[PDB]
């Protein structure tokens, strides 16, 4: 049982850290991308309607 | 007591009115007349097509001799040589009489009740002047809502502005109707009143609602102000005005306690993007004209009580947010102008729980100047805090229990697992008929409390526990 | 009297010198004599939409006023027949010119007046009082639809004077002469009507009656009551392709009429071929469902000002039928394709945009042409009650939700069937997401559910709550596993997968499962559930659901089965068979669970 | 198209058009019309690209008056990798079904490097069948793209988690996935085989599976045919 358990709680522990400094910074990062291009086409839009 | 003579002076003076046949001229929803004579902004019109009918109109803007006047009913059959153009003379306004009650009114305010005339006590400018803030007080006590859910969680102190946040496809229409028919008061009445405009709806909904409001007795503490969905826009835009403008002169010139409710923001937002496309202002963000704050701010802001008037006034508008999100616009501002919201959960909906609303989210800011001793029972502002955190606790704890079992469970976790499951079950869920007093609710909820050993409650004083754990 | 073209551009051409047009006349242009119609006035100059093709006109053209809006003829004979945008038939038009082409200005009547028609007179006499919408006599179109009333239209009162008497005539000889300050009045067996202007009727009323569109999923948990709106995702193998078909063949419509907006062009031919030889067996097994139905078919092609106006024929058409009294079920084919038109039509013009590039008028304009659906009325002496039930069929644009059409249609419409990317990728052929999907007239159909089945709304609502349950347990049990888990959340994931895999898929091809009536499927609802709360109740009091299992995989594989009890063999002894089933599964619990 | 509408029409022959990149085609559309002023579309494209392009797809079919046919496969160039462009949206909603190219197969050096996942063909239902072709053509296409569909699911998902987390079923379909990939799609540039003989490869490729989970294919064609 102790050594199941070692294992188990090892496995757990790097996955559980490894999702925290990965994953959420690599998907937020995209987010701020996505953002930042869905707010220029507005731009460029407006620009022509004025025109 | 000398009000009869400016009535008088300004009452008694016929005056002669224009006619004219010199139309120019028509761009889609719009209209070009070409020698007016001192025209005026804002006006109100007449026309006459070929065919005898009879429509009406609203100019929009005037160069030199020129007016742009748009029709409400489209502009189809119109001509340019037959039609005949008639001028009014003063802006819009609307008959106030005391004996609005129980009458159902157009979306113009036209008797569609088939009643006779108003019989005006007097004429008002729609869009009156804004509440001086130093003559402006802060809301005190509480209204009696009859839901579980809101009265005891979420009072609303009168002078409060609470919106209602829910999907398009929620029975928020259900709940409004629901909270009309309930409201009141509370003693611990011949002073309360309700004005219930509802712009944008199906026709069932209108035929729901008269038909429920007629035969539940509540209609003649009512004034309904309804617009369906193919009426046009410009009177849907002008509703709101009417119903606040009315509301408002109930509440400060005769001195009772009004409750104002929308029913619907987002197909105001519509009708309000189709204005300023007849004129050539540039869309704004998600194509909304940018200016909507400040209309939005004049809608909202004719509420709270008053300095020396013993009246008062609250709304409940409610919203849709298109997919669900809070980051789009109206419910933004929405937010930014009023005090908290009420959420209407999916899920919730989906499991068939009436009123579906989630309590997480929710908040509301007066509720410290809501609760209270005299104004209700001294228990309140306690157990909202403790169910609110106790309903927080259960949530994650039904969430491990898939993770982890059930035994690894601590008894707290267990315990609050199984109040979880009453509290929706029993709590939230309420009878579409079913009225409850404040003190029904909280009796429930301390029933609902007893399921914890009395010490473990710890954000509850031990004042309270003393007095009310008993039994 | 006539007017010099002044300018041309696409479609829009810009005429002058003519002063007292309307806003929306019909105007002949060109020497052809190509229908258009006005849409902007100043001064003079008066801009023109066309209908058709413009190549090769001239300035100084001659252009000719109607100073009537558009119309369409309305009488006997619309049944069985096919028209395009503008309620020009197809088979004439072929079969006059014999070529494949339709020649630019051609011009025939929407109605053929060659054919004679048998006539019985009604009820009035002369010297009687009449008014608008009264029946004054009737007139056999075809042995499936025996009874095609014939209507004084509205906006027309007065006293009788002569009524021609019984026989055969077609619909070109007056046969009724109205007294009235004038005697002008003359009327033969058709009429026409403005179709941009909502028919009148007396009033409306409330739909509290169910539509049987014979499919579990929509029939139990999103039902649609007659005289409703709808919305529902195109796909082709979410099973709308083939919904439509078995509306037409089982729904109890009375007349309905197909309206393809923008059709693709060779799914046109595939469904003209279709609908010819699709029986319905009801007082007889008429084979031509034809008789039923006519067909408003425009592609692409064809020019966007009449996909502009094409469902605004169809609804006219339909409001029509439901003036005699009749059950009429009108169906679209793409809301898009109309908003699209729409939106072309508006940049044309030189509008400015302010929604995505739509107009702004866009959601008033749908809410109009949605609110003429309902239960009514009719506007006659004989007290007449029909119902108008359009079901739209919203395309998805990329985005699920982010279009605007879509949220415009969801303002108004009151049921909506979204559309599941999931299922559809694992041809689920019924695609419906049970978790934005809705439906309001849940809350009324109780009414006649109490009377038949009163247990529909508690059942469907336990039925709602377990998956609801189920997909939120597996949010979380893929990110661990399903290790840790209680009997019971066992017992609710296997229940929902069998619901969703059993109940909800169903092929639309099957003799058996062609169409689900509502007792079987009451029946096969009620057989899962209680199946569901036995197992429930038996491992409460204590029992391994693992052991337990293994004996019930018999009945398990017995309601598994179930739905292969084909209908239409007792429609009685069915639900016999379902009985005998439920008190087995309750014996064999019983025994197994010693 | 002006040609093969005479060709088809006036000569009675089969015909087959195979006009490329009309990508170019509505670039220079969209050149024209801006030296104009008027309304600009989406992304700055005129409004009635969608008439246009109608006008352009339409001509193709076949009528009863004569017995030729005419069929169009044009090519398209999404400018960024995305089917969201108007160009290709436009297309979508005109054509009947379109067959998708991705990068991915490219780079994994598979040809011909298509994606069957996005692609759909409408009038396949029809054109299949008994007497026209084998039986089971109808369903068996449909079991093989749900099987993808799983594949590629549970791959996406084991991605991140692991095999730990697989069932019988992840781990049998990601094999399969394989499978599939490497030998189904793949072919030479000079290679051809027979409606036949993919159906024989794909019913190799299926017994891989046990005889029960094929739940979407019919217990006829099931039992006839996966026996052996």
Same mark, same amino acid.
């Given at each position: ?51 | ?141 509480? !209204? ?92 849907? !835009?002008?509703?709101? /005005? ?230 | ?190 009429? =026409? ?22 499919? /579990? ?189 879509? =949220? ?187």
């Amino acid at each position: 049982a102790f050594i199941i358990l070692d294992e188990v709680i090892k496995v757990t522990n790097r996955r559980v850290n490894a999702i925290e400094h990965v994953i959420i910074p690599r998907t937020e990062n995209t987010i701020a991308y996505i953002n930042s291009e869905l707010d220029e086409l507005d731009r460029e839009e407006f620009y022509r309607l004025k025109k | 007591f000398a009000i009869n003579k400016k009535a008088v002076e300004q009452g008694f003076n016929v005056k002669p009115r224009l006619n004219y046949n010199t139309v120019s001229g028509v761009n889609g929803p719009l209209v070009i007349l070409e020698k007016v004579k001192f025209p005026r902004y804002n006006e109100i019109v007449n026309l006459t097509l070929p065919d005898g009918t009879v429509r009406q109109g609203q100019v929009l803007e005037i160069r030199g001799d020129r007016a742009i006047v748009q029709v409400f009913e489209g502009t189809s059959g119109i001509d340019v040589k037959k039609t005949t153009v008639e001028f009014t003379g003063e802006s819009l306004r609307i008959p106030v009489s005391e004996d609005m009650l129980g009458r159902i009114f157009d979306g113009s305010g036209r008797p569609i009740d088939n009643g006779p005339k108003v019989f005006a006590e007097d004429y008002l400018d729609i869009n009156g002047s804004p509440i001086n803030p130093y003559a402006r007080i802060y809301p005190e006590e509480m !209204i009696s809502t009859g839901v579980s859910a809101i009265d005891t969680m979420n009072s609303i102190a009168r002078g409060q502005k609470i919106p209602i946040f829910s999907a398009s496809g929620l029975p928020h229409n259900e709940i409004a109707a629901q909270i009309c028919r309930q409201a009141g008061l509370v003693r611990p009445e011949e002073n309360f009143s309700i004005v219930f405009a509802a712009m944008g709806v199906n026709l069932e909904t209108a035929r729901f609602f008269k038909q429920d409001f007629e035969e539940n007795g509540s209609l003649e503490r009512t004034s309904l102000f309804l617009n369906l969905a193919n009426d046009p826009t410009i009177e849907r !835009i002008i509703t709101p /005005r009417l119903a606040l403008t009315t509301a408002e002169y109930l509440a400060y010139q005769t001195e009772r306690h009004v409750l104002t409710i929308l029913t619907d923001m987002s197909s105001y937002a519509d009708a309000l993007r189709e204005v300023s496309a007849a004129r050539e202002e540039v869309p704004g963000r998600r194509g909304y004209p940018g200016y909507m704050y400040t209309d939005l701010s004049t809608i909202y802001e004719r509420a709270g009580r008053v300095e020396g008037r013993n009246g008062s006034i609250t709304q409940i508008p409610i919203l849709t947010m298109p997919n669900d999100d809070i980051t789009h616009p109206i419910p933004d501002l929405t937010g930014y102008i009023t005090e908290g919201q009420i959420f209407v959960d999916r899920q919730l909906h989906n499991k068939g729980i009436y009123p579906p609303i989630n309590v997480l989210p929710s908040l509301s800011r007066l509720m410290k100047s809501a609760i209270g001793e005299g104004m209700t029972r001294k228990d309140h502002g306690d157990v909202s805090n403790q169910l609110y955190a106790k309903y927080a606790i259960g949530k994650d704890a039904a969430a491990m229990k898939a993770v982890v079992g059930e035994e690894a469970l601590s008894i707290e976790d267990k315990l609050s697992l199984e109040f979880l499951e009453k509290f929706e079950k029993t709590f939230i869920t309420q009878g579409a008929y079913e009225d409850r007093t404040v003190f029904e609710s909280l009796d429930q909820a301390w029933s609902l409390l007893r399921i914890y050993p009395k010490e473990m409650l710890n954000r509850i004083s031990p004042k309270i526990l003393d007095e009310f754990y008993d039994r | 009297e006539y007017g010099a073209i002044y300018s041309v551009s696409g479609p829009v051409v810009i005429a002058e010198n003519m002063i007292g047009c309307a806003m929306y006349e019909l105007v002949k242009v060109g020497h052809d004599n190509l229908v258009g119609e006005v849409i902007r006035i100043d001064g003079d100059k008066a801009t023109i939409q066309v209908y058709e093709e413009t190549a090769g006109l001239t300035v100084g053209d001659p252009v000719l006023r109607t100073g009537k809006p558009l119309s369409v003829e309305l009488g006997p004979g619309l049944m069985e027949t096919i028209y395009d945008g503008i309620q020009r038939p197809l088979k004439a038009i072929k079969e006059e010119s014999q070529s494949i082409y339709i020649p630019r200005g051609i011009d025939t009547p929407a109605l053929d007046r060659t054919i004679k028609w048998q006539f019985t007179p009604g009820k009035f006499q002369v010297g009687d009082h009449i008014s608008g919408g009264d029946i004054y006599g009737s007139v056999f179109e075809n042995s499936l639809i025996s009874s095609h009333k014939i209507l004084l239209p509205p906006r027309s009162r007065g006293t009788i004077t002569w009524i021609a008497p019984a026989g055969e005539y077609t619909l070109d000889e007056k046969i009724l002469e109205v007294e009235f300050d004038g005697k002008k009045s003359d009327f033969t067996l058709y009429h =026409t009507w403005p179709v941009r202007v909502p028919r009148p009727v007396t009033e409306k009323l409330s739909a509290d009656y169910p539509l049987l569109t014979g499919q /579990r999923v929509l029939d139990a948990l999103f039902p649609c009551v007659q005289g409703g709106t709808t919305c529902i995702p195109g796909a082709f193998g979410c099973g709308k392709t083939v919904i439509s078909q078995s509306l037409s063949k089982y729904s109890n419509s009375d007349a309905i009429i197909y309206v393809g907006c923008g059709e693709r062009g060779n799914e046109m031919a595939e469904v003209l071929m279709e609908f010819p030889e699709l029986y319905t067996e009801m007082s007889g097994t008429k084979e031509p469902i034809m008789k039923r139905t006519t067909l408003v078919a425009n592609t692409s092609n064809m020019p966007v000002a009449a996909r502009e106006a094409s469902i605004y024929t169809g609804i006219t058409l339909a409001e029509y039928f439901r003036d005699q009294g009749k059950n009429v079920s009108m169906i679209a084919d793409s809301s898009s394709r109309w908003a699209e038109a729409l939106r072309e039509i508006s940049g044309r013009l030189g509008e400015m945009p302010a929604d995505q590039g739509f107009p702004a008028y866009l959601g008033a304009k749908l809410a109009s042409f949605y609110e003429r659906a309902g239960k009514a009325v009719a506007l006659g002496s004989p007290d007449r009650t029909g119902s108008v039930s359009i079901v739209a069929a919203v395309s998805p644009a990329g985005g699920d939700f982010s279009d605007p059409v879509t =949220t415009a249609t969801l303002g108004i419409t009151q049921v909506f069937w979204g559309l599941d990317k999931k299922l559809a990728q694992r041809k689920h052929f019924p695609s419906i997401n049970t978790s934005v999907s809705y439906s309001k007239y849940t809350n009324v159909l109780n009414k006649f559910y109490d009377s038949n089945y009163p247990e529909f709304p508690v059942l469907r609502d336990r039925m709602k709550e377990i998956l609801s349950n189920a997909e939120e347990l597996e949010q979380v049990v893929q990110l661990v596993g399903k290790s840790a888990l209680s009997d019971s959340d066992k017992i609710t994931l296997d229940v929902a997968t069998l619901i969703k895999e059993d109940f909800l898929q169903q092929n639309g091809y099957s003799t058996y499962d062609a169409f689900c009536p509502i007792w079987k499927t009451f029946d096969m609802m009620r057989a899962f559930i209680s199946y569901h709360d036995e197992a429930q109740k038996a491992v409460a009091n204590g029992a391994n659901w693992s052991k337990l299992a293994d004996s019930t995989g018999d009945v398990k594989h017995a309601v598994s089965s179930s739905k292969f009890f084909e209908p239409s063999r007792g429609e009685k002894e069915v639900h016999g068979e379902f009985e005998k089933l439920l008190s087995t599964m309750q014996e064999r619990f019983a025994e197994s669970t010693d």
